[PDB]
Amino acid sequence: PRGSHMAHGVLLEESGLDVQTIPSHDVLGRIVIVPETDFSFDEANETIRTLARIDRRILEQAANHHIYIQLLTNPITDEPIARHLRGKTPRGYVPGSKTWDEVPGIGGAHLVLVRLGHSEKGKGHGSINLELHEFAHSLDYIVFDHIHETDEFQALWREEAPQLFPREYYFLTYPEEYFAESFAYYYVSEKTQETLRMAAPRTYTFIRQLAERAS
Ligand SMILES: [Zn+2]
Numbered sequence: 001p002r003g004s005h006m007a008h009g010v011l012l013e014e015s016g017l018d019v020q021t022i023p024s025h026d027v028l029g030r031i032v033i034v035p036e037t038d039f040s041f042d043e044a045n046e047t048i049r050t051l052a053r054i055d056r057r058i059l060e061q062a063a064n065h066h067i068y069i070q071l072l073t074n075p076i077t078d079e080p081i082a083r084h085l086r087g088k089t090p091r092g093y094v095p096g097s098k099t100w101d102e103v104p105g106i107g108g109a110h111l112v113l114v115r116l117g118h119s120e121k122g123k124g125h126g127s128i129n130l131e132l133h134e135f136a137h138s139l140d141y142i143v144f145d146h147i148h149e150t151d152e153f154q155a156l157w158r159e160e161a162p163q164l165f166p167r168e169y170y171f172l173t174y175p176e177e178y179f180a181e182s183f184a185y186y187y188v189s190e191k192t193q194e195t196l197r198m199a200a201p202r203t204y205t206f207i208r209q210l211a212e213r214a215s
Contacts, residue, residue, distance in 0.1 A: 107134030160200035
């Protein structure tokens with residue numbers, strides 16, 4: 001007997017997956033959607049533990065805005081709301097060099113999609129951490145009302161992105177990318193956070209106090 005509450009994915013808190021030792025699992029349990037078919041517990045656990053590095057208040061903001069992060073085993077282009085992307089070139093790639101079938105995440109809307117097994121840099125994307133980068137887009141646009149467009153953030157981007165991302169075109173020249181990748185550096189590890197702090201100290205402080213900038 002399969003219930004319709006699990007037919008299209010399972011909310012983490014309803015999944016029976018054991019997350020009791022994960023910080024903020026009470027909040028993440030209402031944000032993360034896991035597959036209703038077989039998936040790797042190790043891959044899901046690592047993704048959820050990375051998201052649990054985020055300031056609890058930001059997670060609460062995301063939950064109260066009803067942002068969800070759906071973890072997938074199959075490609076994003078098998079989801080009906082992304083089916084139009086099958087076989088198409090993603091913006092910014094040379095045609096023939098990439099299709100949306102090969103893109104493992106999408107962020108910015110109230111539903112974030114992340115395919116399991118692709119977190120690290122180079123696995124179909126160029127971010128230090130796929131799930132933090134994509135979630136940061138949705139935070140930026142929804143919780144923080146396009147904060148990458150504010151005068152304060154624009155000035156951080158101008159002054160510090162050339163120091164932090166001199167060799168990474170999209171993180172250097174797109175303010176929404178600078179926001180999302182800076183967020184991922186702050187939260188993926190202590191080592192990347194200290195890299196951010198040394199190369200881009202004002203951006204570091206901006207991310208550290210981000211929770212006080214919501215709307
Ligand atoms: Zn991005």
